[PDB]
Amino acid sequence: CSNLLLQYGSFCTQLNRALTGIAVEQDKNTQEVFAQVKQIYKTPPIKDF
Amino acid sequence: LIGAEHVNNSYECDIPIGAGICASYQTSQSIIAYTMSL
Numbered sequence A: 001c002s003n004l005l006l007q008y009g010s011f012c013t014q015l016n017r018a019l020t021g022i023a024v025e026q027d028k029n030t031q032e033v034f035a036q037v038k039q040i041y042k043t044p045p046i047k048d049f
Numbered sequence B: 001l002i003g004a005e006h007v008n009n010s011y012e013c014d015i016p017i018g019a020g021i022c023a024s025y026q027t028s029q030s031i032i033a034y035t036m037s038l
C-alpha cells in the first residue's frame, strides 16, 4: 500500500495542512474570544454590591 | 516530551504545545517547559 502511495502522497500531503490549518485555527479561535484582557482580575472579598 | 526540563514557575509562553503547557528558551540557557501564565 505504501509503494502505491507515492502516486497519492501529494493528496496525503495537502490534507495535512487542511487538517493542520483547521487545528491551528480552532486554537486561534479561543485566543480571539477569551484572551481580550492581559490582566487577570481577582474578585473582591466583599460581596456587598 | 523529551529533552526539555519542566519547571514549576510560570511565565508568558510563545510556542503553544497543548493541554495548558507551552515551551520556551529560558536560562547556561536551555529549552524549558512550563504551564503558561494567563
Ligand SMILES: *[C@@H]1O[C@H](CO)[C@@H](O)[C@H](O)[C@H]1NC(C)=O
Binding pocket: B006, B007, B008, B009
Ligand atoms: C515547585 O515548587 C513547589 C513548591 O511546593 C514544589 O513542591 C515543586 O517540587 C517545585 N517543582 C520543581 C520542579 O522543583
